[PDB]
Ligand binder design. Structure first.
Ligand SMILES: CC(C)C[C@H](N)C(=O)O
Ligand code: NA
Length: 465
């Protein structure tokens, strides 16, 4: 045949990618970010609905963008199309240095924690055991995605089914508790509600942070069986599912747990399970583990394809595209991503890094949408299969301006450190990537070419063609 990443993604695989990467484990463990800043059950539910609506706006923007540009790499390929080079290398680098390795490593550590949780419910799980299970999970998922692409989509589908079945168990338990008559929590809700622009803005911020997995399928979009039809349809099938699941899962939590017994909880779903299931309360930490497995597989697929496209341009070394000659899977990109994710596992406290890259993440999303608006102004008659109204790009541009202005006045020093990360990768751009390949150092090209030729047959990868 021809060495090239085949399509090998259906509509169901796309819905499962988006849903498994958007749900994750922040609805089982910490769904109390909206409830802290909105002191009511009713107001927190309304803010969940409003955040879901604004995330639907952003996801419609990204469906339009993905059918317009049609290149893998969610915001990298959309900053590279409207803007170029600069601001696309920075985002790619940001994702390479901090965003993707931290995200993955944290998902792996959470998987390990909630795998060993049923036998460590009160005490702390060991640090070495958590890190070794996280490393084993990252290695297994990187290998499964290095073997075949259909294996990666299959694992994603299985563990997304597991996610939604656990969340449907939670939702059904909550709705049954409501139906027996013991509501007593929505009896007089909207009572302690805090109505202040600060606390409502922070609740909206937490809600919009909860839905952060709709650009997933925009990373693997050269690998969809019919992108012009399976990107918008997959996104518009996955947004209602995740929104309704979030709202109904919070309804279940609020039905069973009172506020006290829900803000002092280290893992809400777990408490919910301990309080309603009795024994078989271990189903929920196991389900958080399976949820993190699915989310980590989605993260690995997305990051591997982002680095594939990064090196397909002049940004990363052109030994990262390098599709496998007989499996048609990006082996060097997946290996590089897994190595970078296993390096961050050695960091003891790895959530300060979340605090480092929050602002940069939402800045790059907003810059992708601004690039969409620019591509609507410049080059208007460029082929657009989905030409949505200019209302969704504008509304989510404002919403991401808000999501980026919150961390720039709340924790202004961590956002500056994230900016430092990006423009600290910048010195690789003005001396290696900006210079033509023929005048850059002869010996450095020699070394890189030899290393590439020695991880070529090793990865059994001949890149494109
Ligand atoms: C999309 C993910 C990176 C975030 C996800 N909503 C969570 O469970 O925390
Ligand atoms: Na996102």
């Amino acid at each position: 045949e021809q060495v090239k990443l085949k399509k090998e993604i259906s509509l169901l695989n796309g819905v499962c990618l988006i849903v498994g990467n958007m749900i994750g484990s922040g609805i089982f463990v910490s769904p109390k970010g909206v409830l802290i800043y909105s002191a009511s059950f009713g107001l927190s539910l309304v803010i969940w609905a409003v955040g879901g609506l604004f995330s639907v706006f952003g996801a419609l923007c990204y469906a339009e963008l993905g059918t317009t540009i049609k290149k893998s790499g969610a915001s990298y390929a959309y900053i590279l199309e409207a803007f170029g080079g600069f601001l696309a290398f920075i985002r790619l680098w940001t994702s390479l240095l901090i965003i993707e390795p931290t995200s993955q490593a944290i998902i792996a550590i959470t998987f390990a924690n909630y795998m060993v949780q049923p036998l460590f419910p009160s005490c702390f799980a060991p640090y070495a055991a958590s890190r070794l299970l996280a490393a084993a999970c990252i290695c297994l998922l990187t290998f499964i995605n290095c073997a075949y692409v259909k294996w990666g989509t299959l694992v994603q589908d299985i563990f997304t089914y597991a996610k939604v079945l656990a969340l449907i168990a939670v939702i059904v338990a909550g709705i049954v508790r409501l139906g027996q008559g013991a509501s007593t929590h929505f009896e007089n809700s909207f009572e302690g509600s805090s109505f202040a622009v600060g606390d409502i803005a922070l609740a909206l911020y937490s809600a919009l942070f909860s839905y952060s997995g709709w650009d997933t399928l925009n990373y693997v979009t050269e690998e969809i069986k019919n992108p012009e039809r399976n990107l918008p349809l997959s996104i518009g099938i996955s947004m209602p599912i995740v929104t309704i699941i979030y709202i109904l899962t919070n309804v279940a939590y609020y039905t069973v747990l009172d506020m006290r017994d829900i803000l002092a909880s280290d893992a809400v779903a777990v408490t919910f399970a301990d309080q309603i299931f009795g024994i078989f309360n271990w189903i929920i930490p196991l389900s958080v583990a399976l949820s993190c497995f699915g989310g980590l597989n989605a993260s690995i697929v997305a990051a591997s394809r982002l680095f594939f496209v990064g090196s397909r341009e002049g940004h990363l070394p052109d030994a990262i595209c390098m599709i496998h000659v007989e499996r048609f899977t990006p082996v060097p990109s997946l290996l590089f991503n897994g190595i970078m994710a296993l390096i961050y596992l050695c960091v003891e406290d790895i959530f300060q890094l979340i605090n480092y890259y929050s602002f940069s993440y939402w800045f790059f999303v907003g810059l992708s949408i601004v690039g969409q608006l620019y591509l609507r102004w410049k080059e208007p008659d460029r082929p657009r299969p989905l030409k949505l109204s200019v209302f969704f790009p504008i509304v989510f541009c404002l919403c991401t301006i808000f999501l980026v202005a919150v961390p720039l006045y709340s924790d202004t020093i961590n956002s500056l450190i994230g900016i430092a990360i990006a423009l600290s990768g910048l010195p690789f751009y003005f001396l290696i990537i900006r210079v033509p390949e023929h005048k850059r150092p002869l010996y450095l090209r020699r070394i890189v070419g030899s290393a590439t030729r020695y991880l070529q047959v090793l990865c059994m990868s001949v890149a494109a063609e």
